[PDB]
Amino acid sequence: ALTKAEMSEYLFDKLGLSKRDAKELVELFFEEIRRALENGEQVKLSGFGNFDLRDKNQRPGRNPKTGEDIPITARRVVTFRPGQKLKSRVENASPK
């Protein structure tokens, strides 16, 4: 799978950044998206997609193994809505 290491490697090759800064830019990139989200802000990355926050009320759940009814607690979660551009680039992909 694509990893932080691979992404850093690409920044090194493609933009000639130092391996030290490439490594830090990648980490900063994801951290900056996390920070915005923990701050309740929507992240919209044109050409890729949106990371949105949804507040979910409590609802019925259970222990799949057994069957003990357990309420899925209220929570705010992160969802990703891929844009149309990315959707098109991927619709005919083939899982490696």
Partner: protein, 94 residues
């Protein structure tokens, strides 16, 4: 926060990497991620989340505006699953 605002926030912070460099880097990373998915490969960033492709079977859909039938072939769509650190940090509730 838009893509350009992300670039500005990054640029500011670390005053030891050129603004233009950050612009190029961010754009390049996103293309790298996009192309990875277009290639049918997964993305796995610990603490942030992982991206993969979910299959959608062919089906007889409809133009919801006219009700006309439309034959849709099988396809793949991106799917994102938030990692632990992102889940916890984003979830304000208890």
């Amino acid at each position: 926060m838009t893509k350009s605002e992300l670039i500005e926030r990054l640029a500011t912070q670390q005053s030891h990497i050129p603004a233009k460099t950050v612009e190029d880097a961010v754009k390049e990373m996103l293309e790298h991620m996009a192309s990875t998915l277009a290639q049918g490969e997964r993305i796995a960033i610990r603490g942030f989340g992982s991206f993969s492709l979910h299959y959608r079977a062919p089906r007889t859909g409809r133009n919801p505006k006219t009700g006309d039938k439309v034959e849709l072939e099988g396809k793949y769509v991106p799917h994102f699953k938030p990692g632990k650190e992102l889940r916890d940090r984003a979830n304000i509730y208890g």
